[PDB]
Point group: C3
Chain length 118, copies 3
């Protein structure tokens, strides 16, 4: 998979970035088998105030996780995975769960090339 992680600049220390990457990676690994290859977590930082909810400028604690997945997993499994991401990122990023949005996009596995794939 690739997890694009949208966070405000400097909210995550180097240690926290590692912790959040671990939380997401371990979540994915925990809910998949040996078919799993490698999870990428790609942090995308922007200055605080670049997020608006209902038109209202936010203070910088929001995290949006956009997970790019292969097709085929059940709704129940994806639900468990999103839940685990919310729970574990909440701890790693030191934020209330309400600050976390998680969206999954699915693609045919054939058009997902990793580290020189298929």
């Amino acid at each position: 998979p690739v997890y694009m992680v949208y966070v405000s600049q400097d909210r995550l220390t180097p240690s926290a970035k590692h912790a959040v990457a671990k939380a997401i990676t371990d979540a994915h690994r925990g809910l998949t088998g040996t078919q799993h290859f490698l999870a990428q977590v790609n942090f995308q930082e922007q200055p605080a105030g670049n997020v608006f909810l209902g038109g209202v400028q936010q203070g910088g604690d929001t995290i949006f996780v956009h997970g790019l997945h292969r097709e085929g997993r059940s709704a129940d499994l994806k639900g468990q995975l999103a839940q685990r991401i919310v729970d574990d990122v909440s701890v790693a990023a030191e934020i209330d769960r309400k600050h976390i949005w998680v969206y999954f996009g699915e693609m045919p596995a054939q058009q997902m090339v990793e580290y020189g794939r298929f």
Copy 2:
């Protein structure tokens, strides 16, 4: 929904960022009912010159709006929504309509978690 908004650094003043977020949010709200919960607009700024069209470096006025939506809306409705976004962002960002690209991606609602959802 989540609207990722790709703009060049400093093109939008704080007031313009609010205006563009309002334009997008109001567009979505105007074409949905009470099932609508909350629209996120997430600005992603990069230095001018990071956009290439047909291999040609652009001057910084381009805006790409990547809207992440639930599945199920009609082609006609999505068309109206994209059109309204182009029209209203053109005004808010003080740019010619030609500078605006709008793409919508759709996901099963179940794998869209907002502010601690489903």
Copy 3:
């Protein structure tokens, strides 16, 4: 199409950015016909160390190309396109092929508005 290109800050010189944009644009053009309109390549730079693979912080050479496409192309064609992108970006960005990830997302053409489309 829109190609979002996630790279580490300063890895690509202005000339290299042009070269990578050319590589991606020419790849798309080479595998499409006159129905093709215009390819956008949109560079998204972040400080080196914002990419984690299997929880391990990377040194900054990774490039993730997220291609946003219309629906309808064959698996074989998409495979050729991803392969060409990997090969040609490897040269343009002066990196080993292993550093390149390429994912394609597909949308109904009707909800892809370019430069004031449909």
